[PDB]
Structure 1
């Protein structure tokens, strides 16, 4: 916990930055099709999210192992589900970076419109991806410092509106569009949840990165809960404020409602600032998620549950080869941005890989109960209550997702089972083996 370890502040900002990412600037537009009643959804979401964060906070307290969810799963269920957890989470991590870099450079197209030409966009995206791979190769202190700065920058317009927009906030504007979904109350709330439940992916960030965090038993829980709280407060305040500052129709039509509304309100410099800050958030988030990919792959390979090259490190302990591999894969999938059709072809892959993350969450909740029951004391009813909420959080997220995406997630589980069996027979140790031949 000295030289190559990351301090509390950069880790906390990595959690909140990984969570807020691209999404925070786009949330009001997505929620505007439902209306102000979305506040109820937020209320439901945050209680769930906090629950999940607490689950991680306690689990990482009990076991600050590198790789987080993976390790926990491995502890309570064994090598097969550890293997599965890592495959799913690793894939989610680097596949999710494509959309993020596309959105991020997209924000930068405010200054340089050539970035909307799909070819230049693709080249630029590949270059930026490799920039953050290289920053990750320099080391975790470097990447978390870069993301810390990026996250503060991204927080500038969010906190700005979330504090000072209230002078322009009109309750009549907010309530004029309380429910424009056409649905009853539960339906409207559900259509809200279909957006907001996915807003807290990244809660697991500090847990997974526990191996490079200074004093992780103390700092990982703090960073987890703190990052989630920062995200929640920003989410609510900013979306509510904007819903009270801008008429619902305009909010619905806008593709960048902080930026379009900023550019119109305080001038073009405002739009430039919001665009720059949004781009900063996205690009820093790239660094964070790449770090997480490297870490999970490294822990799994360290246990012989992922190819050994993912555990090959330099003198600093950085998984350089694994990061380069992730770079190559991301580069290959990034080619989808060369055309609208190519982009939409890739879209269902992204949507599926986002669902991948929920299995690590589920196993983390289960791991908390199965591994840590002897640490609960007479606060056991509370733990059960919180973890159950966290369980519900995950399940509901899937319940509201598109059927096709979940179908292909299921297929992915099956393929992973087949892969484990075909690659690890003779190596795998059985809980209840057959007698000797």
Structure 2
């Protein structure tokens, strides 16, 4: 096949969701803190690198298609998989709604503008659909748009990773020194309280599967290249930091920012098409998506993410906590952990005895991964996690709707 992508457009998507909506936001998240505190970054890159590897090498066995759900289909796979999915999908779709509200806001001024009344909402509801459609074109199409836009946003970031280096200068950061974060002990958790909840997505490559050239070769390479890119970009970017705290060409960045979300939203809906229209096969959803207007893509699927994505989009017009941490914008984030947690489970009970010897190694990196997945949750909105819980319980109750599976029965 050839209308089904290739390494370089995929690793760009993997780097491109992770990158991503968060960078033009990170430093200030660590300025009201609590900044530098670079340790925070050392921990998190270790953790996420491990998570990237767990996936990297779980897809290297069975990819997938989902993924993060095939796997959960072998830490069960029914109930646990249908819930791993519902709860994932249910959090790629939800994510966008609060992703655009920001990416349009990177254009708040500069053409359009406007960008204030019912106009941001109605402009945003329009953009969502540009991408639903760019996928009905795709998928080889959306990843293509995607690769471009994210490279456009590499302009600035890796503009500083080398150009920014040649600039500042220098001991000013040393002036800002550490502190602001109250001592090593616990001041790391200012950075781990943000460096962490913005490194999500390492799944995407293990999530494509069907829509990548060779899964068994291209997919891992993708997750790893993507993450490594993401990590490095992260570090060399939030090291351009001298002391400030109060929150011509500069225009190219006020744009190359919404440019990261031009490619993003596409990638992310692409995954909400897959990590559902999948489970809509293997077993159940219910489905529906399907139905797959021939030659790939789920016309039905992404078009339902449209209707849906909208309906919220124009009620989070508007309040819901009028930006991130929306008590509903963040829950779609905690959600995505449960799939990470099960991916880790599977990357072991499917290495039954590993389809690969010399284990004392793997039995390690996945334990890191468990830690990442767990610690992320542990430092988090008390209300905002309790909700993630009530979700699961109702998602389960909602195998009233599915009253027909099996295993070990009367």
TM over 0.5, shorter chain = yes
How far the C-alpha of 1:423 sits from its partner, in A, is: 2.6
**Residue 344 to residue 5, structure 1, CA distance change in 2 (3 Å):** closer
Rounded Cα–Cα distance in structure 2 between residues aligned with 1:165 and 1:272: 17
**Residue 309 to residue 376, structure 1, CA distance change in 2 (3 Å):** closer
How far the C-alpha of 1:377 sits from its partner, in A, is: 4.3
Secondary structure in structure 2 of the residue aligned to 1:137: helix
**Residue 337 to residue 359, structure 1, CA distance change in 2 (3 Å):** closer
**Residue 403 to residue 160, structure 1, CA distance change in 2 (3 Å):** same
Residue pair 1:170, 1:245 contacting (<8 A) in 2 also: no
Rounded Cα–Cα distance in structure 1 between residues aligned with 2:270 and 2:171: 45
Rounded Cα–Cα distance in structure 2 between residues aligned with 1:426 and 1:16: 38
Gaps of 5+ in 2: none
Residue pair 1:173, 1:246 contacting (<8 A) in 2 also: no
**Residue 33 to residue 220, structure 1, CA distance change in 2 (3 Å):** same
TM-score by length of 1: 0.89
How far the C-alpha of 1:71 sits from its partner, in A, is: 0.7
CA offset digits 1:48-75 (Å, max 9, x no partner): 0110111101100100111100110002
Rounded Cα–Cα distance in structure 2 between residues aligned with 1:137 and 1:117: 30
Rounded Cα–Cα distance in structure 2 between residues aligned with 1:235 and 1:346: 21
Rounded Cα–Cα distance in structure 1 between residues aligned with 2:212 and 2:323: 38
Q: Which moved further from structure 2: 129-138 or 162-171?
A: 162-171
CA offset digits 1:201-237 (Å, max 9, x no partner): 1100011110111111100000000000000000000
Secondary structure in structure 1 of the residue aligned to 2:16: helix
How far the C-alpha of 1:310 sits from its partner, in A, is: 1.3
Secondary structure in structure 1 of the residue aligned to 2:401: helix
Rounded Cα–Cα distance in structure 1 between residues aligned with 2:242 and 2:205: 32
CA offset digits 1:286-337 (Å, max 9, x no partner): 0000000000111110023212211211111211111110011110111134
Residue in structure 2 matched with residue 276 of structure 1 by the alignment: 255
Q: Which moved further from structure 2: 144-153 or 35-44?
A: 35-44
Residue pair 2:49, 2:228 contacting (<8 A) in 1 also: yes
Bigger helix share: 1
CA offset digits 1:322-378 (Å, max 9, x no partner): 111001111011113433467369911111111000011110111011101433544
Aligned residues: 410
Residue pair 1:133, 1:324 contacting (<8 A) in 2 also: yes
**Residue 313 to residue 429, structure 1, CA distance change in 2 (3 Å):** farther
